[PDB]
Subunit: 356 residues, 3 copies
């Protein structure tokens, strides 16, 4: 990738991509997981990412984490979530392929794979240090509380408390697998959360469409329950680009759903990087850094990108240059008036291949 | 206190209690004080606590501290406060036993003991590094300003300025003791603060009551002047329990007003603690940590707890488990369907010992 | 300067002033600049300051910086700015002597000197680590992107892209100089920003005026586009002072426009400083520290001060003492009832030489 400056790509910069596709899975009874955050991907301060799979009837047990909100995208299969708020209200809902959930920091929750095959999903947390090994587990909790107090709290005998787990379960396939949603009723009378905390992203109409390239955007305008986090699906045809831009207000976390992705990141001070991501790899663009995404392959590319702000803000280079008068542009770029007039006058968000 | 995990209580964790009852008082002319913060209680990052007493006519001099808001609970006696805002408005008020004040960050204030008894009160600051040795004193200020500028600022002669203190006074019993509230008028025409910054907590009816156990809560709903701090009084009868819960949004600072308190703290990653607090000792539960409080004694227990958020948010274990369906609970806890149905179906906030 | 305590001025404290007047300029083709922030002025954590000049037709190139909002005061001459928001709207405006601009964090912008004279202005950033060497330059950007992707994004050939700069331009005099404002139209159809992000500070009537001493204040009340920063102009006559006060909510950054300024700063724990600032020097008062400013010279003093909050909050000593009853004051200061009654009963903001 030649540049006008002949910059040494990546020099004096952290990695902006991580080979998450090669990270080994941790295996549980009915599920798998792996994660990427500042502990293995130092640039990724604003968000951490978790891959999880759950077989039918496998549950990610009831837990909470007050250090991070949890935004999710279901890649394959079907899940059911439960979510309990400090007002004592509950949301119990199916989330299918292409759907989202958002669990506010510290609200209690569970996730179950409901089949018929493997559920596979991404979890993105708005704390880059988040680790799935550091969540607050209800089974860990009750096995790390004095037995006599658990007895009193539950109205249970010692012999009943002795039947509870002795350590953090994390993922269970003990069972039973949950049944139809209409029968998934709280054991005790519980009012229902009314603001939706699940959402259908893949089923949205594209916010932007150009020559088969598509952007589907779920910010707080589309999904207000996710009040401080935004997600988008980008589909790029062979040769096409998401145009050069930056985000004034948010970091950007990226996962390649399928295909092969090229990312370039401009970091100021004459420093920049370019790298290729395979399916299942991760990218991270710090707030304010200039960047673009290109499909340099002969096959389609699909990515999910996540922002740690509920308001999607992008300034495209094309918009920026179109907004300025000729004199400012010619003086800035030190170019002829003739060439100045050929700078962008409109922003199409994507760029179609121009190479004949 | 046996547990299902046989966890070594306190292993790999900071102390969550501090033997504040044994901290020596610092003695002033008509007052005493002592304090606990990150400097001696490392876990206590969000809040620091100060004990202070003032004899009749003793004043904690005019001072300010822009690094911390100041929330107070008067344990004994009567105080008079003054509070001056950047709007140039003043609040002059009596605060008696069971009452609160809240001084916003950086607003100027004073506190006087009003007789015939000694005033004793707790001050909780929303910065764990706060120290009473590091406040901005008006007598320190004027003795550390060029004399010629103090003369000009006050319209005073050298001989008048020479009568001012040469250093921080801190606490003074020079006099005069203040008279009745209705005669405590500003020396110059000063508009009055209209939003109350004092409040009666002890005189509230309980928010929650069960079997003699009581919770009185002053959040910003009850006391909007204290916009980002909340306090509560908890009364526990012998053998009774404040149920297992966590706070999604706030740290919890605790002081034992009377009795003996048992506290358990669950910190995730299979780590937990349990300890006993005597009267005048202090506890601290970091945001999100699971906790419960038990009176294991034969005498009543009374505590004050303070949160560094104005919205009280608690998720009780009972609420959480009641909100979930049987399958999720049986799978998580790996227990029989019979036992699953005996999990909580309602939240009574407190739990009671075995009854006749 | 004697004090009641005989405090050693400056003992155990950082510098609260910086000899910015002596900082050397960095020279560009058509402009100059220098800066002061935590890297050379350690106390200055909340704000950094930049001096910049632009010759007629010289431009500070299109750039952005998402780490800092940019507040400006034009000291001499005339500028033209452009400002582009994430809504895809643009503001193109003239800012002359005494005027302000505020560029929100990460919004794209440019600044051009409009002739016939040199434009000289101050930029204050709400991040004390801000450096003009660390901005995101559009010419740096396009020279540090794969050429094939620039071709695609612009619809240009390799030979067209090859005419672009090979590195960060920073300041350019290549031209052309811009024409009249009414002719400075976006190359492509662009909606206009409607909330003003420029403002006339020097032209305001004083918020406070006493004996020739004046304070002009542009907080978010006067200039709502500058939503989280405030600027003020203070004029002090010989012998006059801005009274003792503190700010509960903001740090204060100061620049001496002309004259000679005395600053005192009280830092608690029996520590305080007093320093004299020359024209072009800089002061910084941390949030909550007590302070006062005095003109101890025989000539006028004019300063600009900037706060990293959009709501100007000041508690003057006089207001505070006037708000309290006699008993509280006499007990605090350990003075006679007679002297207690002579403490302040009103706040005139400035104090006059006796
Ligand atoms: Ni979770
Ligand atoms: Ni982006
Ligand atoms: Ni105080
Ligand atoms: Ni609690
Ligand atoms: Ni700038
Ligand atoms: Ni000031």
């Amino acid at each position: 990738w030649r540049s006008l400056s002949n910059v040494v790509w990546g020099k004096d910069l952290p990695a902006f991509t991580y080979a998450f596709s090669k990270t080994p899975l941790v295996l549980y009874d009915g599920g798998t997981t792996k994660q990427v955050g500042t502990y293995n991907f130092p640039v990724s301060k604003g968000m951490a990412g978790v891959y999880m799979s759950l077989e039918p009837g496998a549950i990610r047990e009831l837990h909470w984490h007050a250090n991070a909100a949890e935004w999710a995208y279901v890649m394959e299969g079907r899940t059911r979530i439960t979510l309990t708020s400090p007002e004592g209200k509950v949301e119990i809902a199916d989330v299918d392929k292409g759907g989202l959930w958002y669990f506010p920091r510290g609200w209690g929750h569970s996730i179950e794979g409901i089949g018929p095959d493997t559920a596979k999903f991404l979890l993105v947390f708005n704390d880059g240090t988040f680790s799935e090994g550091a969540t607050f587990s209800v089974t860990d909790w009750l096995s790390h509380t004095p037995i006599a107090w658990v007895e009193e709290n539950l109205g249970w005998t010692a012999a009943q408390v002795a039947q509870l787990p002795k350590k953090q379960v994390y993922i269970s396939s003990y069972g039973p697998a949950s049944g139809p949603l209409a029968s998934a009723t709280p054991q005790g009378q519980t009012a229902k959360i009314e603001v939706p905390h699940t959402h259908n992203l893949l089923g949205q109409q594209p916010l932007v469409s150009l020559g088969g390239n598509e952007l589907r955007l779920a910010s707080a305008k589309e999904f207000p329950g996710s009040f401080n986090m935004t997600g988008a699906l980008i589909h790029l045809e062979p040769g096409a680009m998401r145009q050069l831009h930056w985000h004034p207000n948010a970091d950007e976390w990226q996962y390649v759903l399928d295909g092969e992705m090229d990312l370039t990141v401009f970091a100021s001070e004459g420093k920049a990087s370019v790298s290729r991501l395979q399916q299942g790899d991760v990218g991270y663009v710090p707030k304010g850094y200039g960047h673009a995404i290109r499909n340099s392959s002969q096959k389609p590319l699909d990515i999910v990108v996540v922002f740690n702000d509920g308001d999607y803000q992008s300034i495209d280079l094309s918009t920026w240059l179109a907004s300025n008068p000729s004199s400012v542009l010619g003086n800035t770029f030190q170019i002829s008036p003739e060439l100045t007039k050929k700078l962008p006058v409109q922003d199409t968000i994507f760029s179609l291949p121009t190479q004949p």
